[PDB]
Amino acid sequence: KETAAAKFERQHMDSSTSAASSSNYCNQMMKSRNLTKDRCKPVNTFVHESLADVQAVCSQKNVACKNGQTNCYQSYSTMSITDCRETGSSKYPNCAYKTTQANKHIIVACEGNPYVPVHFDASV
Numbered sequence: 001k002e003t004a005a006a007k008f009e010r011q012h013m014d015s016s017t018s019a020a021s022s023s024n025y026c027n028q029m030m031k032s033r034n035l036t037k038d039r040c041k042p043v044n045t046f047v048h049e050s051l052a053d054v055q056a057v058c059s060q061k062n063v064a065c066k067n068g069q070t071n072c073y074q075s076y077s078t079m080s081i082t083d084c085r086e087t088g089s090s091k092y093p094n095c096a097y098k099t100t101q102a103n104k105h106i107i108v109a110c111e112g113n114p115y116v117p118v119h120f121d122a123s124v
């Protein structure tokens with residue numbers, strides 16, 4: 001069964017490209033990472049940094065999670081990310097997304113031993 005750490009990598013890690021490669025990046029990625037299987041996941045963020053760099057965020061700035069839990073951490077440095085947001089014309093199973101590249105600080109929730117990212121909370 002897929003662990004939460006493995007799910008995070010599948011849903012949010014894309015180290016192959018250092019930025020949103022094209023206007024069609026999200027359309028391709030949301031589908032290939034199985035994020036449009038059950039429904040069109042409305043929003044999702046991909047991180048273009050090494051896995052090591054992202055895991056290290058778990059020992060960075062401790063901040064409150066959107067859900068009230070306190071196991072969230074904010075990256076000290078900005079990181080290259082791509083936000084994928086479902087366009088109004090998108091209709092399951094024909095999910096469609098707008099691809100947006102940015103350099104922001106990421107906030108992830110971490111759990112376990114080793115302490116690793118399991119959820120993407122926000123970017124600021």
Ligand SMILES: Nc1ncnc2c1ncn2[C@@H]1O[C@H](COP(=O)(O)OP(=O)(O)O)[C@@H](OP(=O)(O)O)[C@H]1O
Nearest residue numbers: 003004007011065067069071109110111118119120
């Ligand atoms: N503080 C937190 N806020 C939100 N979710 C958290 C938090 N800490 C851990 N999680 C877990 O982070 C996981 C997030 O998985 P999702 O598939 O919902 O992806 P996403 O939130 O990264 O988009 C959930 O665990 P699961 O593997 O059992 O589904 C969720 O329970």
